[PDB]
Amino acid sequence: TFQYTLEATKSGPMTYLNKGQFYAITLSETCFRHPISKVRSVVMVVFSEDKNRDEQLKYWKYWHSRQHTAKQRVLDIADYKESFNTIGNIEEIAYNAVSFTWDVNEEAKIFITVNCLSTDFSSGLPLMIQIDTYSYNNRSNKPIHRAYCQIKVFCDKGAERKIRDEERDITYFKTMPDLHSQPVLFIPDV
């Protein structure tokens, strides 16, 4: 039914990202007829190991306390026209999540960045990008589709250096069979 891609450095799905560098995510629907065209997707940065909720909010507060500004988010979205013409209703619902609506009859394009290094949760944690797709025609707490992509976030072009060291373009997200489980989203006290 649905399919998402991440345009990054080539490494289920695992991708190496550089902190503060924007990467293109594409949202597409592989059943819909006007006016039934829109869906609402949630792009998140959550932990892979599936630790308890309280553990996950512990790593986020530790990370958040070590930032130079309280306004610093884990996940950020770029305002580029290529993206903003294809998507609507952009909401920064949490520090590690972005919400937007997109038309299934088109292909959605977003540029995102991860501002946490995989090594920032100790003095490397398996992180992942999760995409939740919801119906726009109901207030259900259950997505119609889920998909993930494991990520490793580096600094100073570390992603390229890791690939280069391994040696010495598009990654498809893997569909998550559980629509019941809830992602741990972080919002600090401001």
Swiss-Prot record:
It comes from the Eukaryota. Residues 1-187 form the Grh/CP2 DB domain. It is found in: Nucleus; Membrane. Induction: Expressed in proliferating cells, the expression decreases during senescence. In keratinocytes, expression levels decrease upon calcium exposure. Expressed in keratinocytes (at protein level). Highly expressed in placenta, prostate, brain and kidney. Lower-level expression in a variety of epithelial tissues such as thymus, lung, salivary gland, mammary gland and digestive tract. Expressed in the cochlear. Expressed in corneal epithelial cells, but not in the endothelium or stroma. The record marks 161 as: Important for activation of transcription. GRHL genes (GRHL1, GRHL2 and GRHL3) show a paradoxal lack of redundancy despite their extensive sequence identity in the DNA-binding and protein dimerization domains and the fact that the core consensus DNA binding sites are identical. They have related but remarkably different functions during embryogenesis because of their differential spatiotemporal expression patterns during development. Belongs to the grh/CP2 family. Grainyhead subfamily. It is linked to Deafness, autosomal dominant, 28: A form of non-syndromic sensorineural hearing loss. Sensorineural deafness results from damage to the neural receptors of the inner ear, the nerve pathways to the brain, or the area of the brain that receives sound information. DFNA28 is characterized by mild to moderate hearing loss across most frequencies that progresses to severe loss in the higher frequencies by the fifth decade. Homodimer, also forms heterodimers with GRHL1 or GRHL3. Transcription factor playing an important role in primary neurulation and in epithelial development. Binds directly to the consensus DNA sequence 5'-AACCGGTT-3' acting as an activator and repressor on distinct target genes. During embryogenesis, plays unique and cooperative roles with GRHL3 in establishing distinct zones of primary neurulation. Essential for closure 3 (rostral end of the forebrain), functions cooperatively with GRHL3 in closure 2 (forebrain/midbrain boundary) and posterior neuropore closure. This is Grainyhead-like protein 2 homolog. The gene is GRHL2. The chain holds residues 247 to 485 of 625 of the full protein.
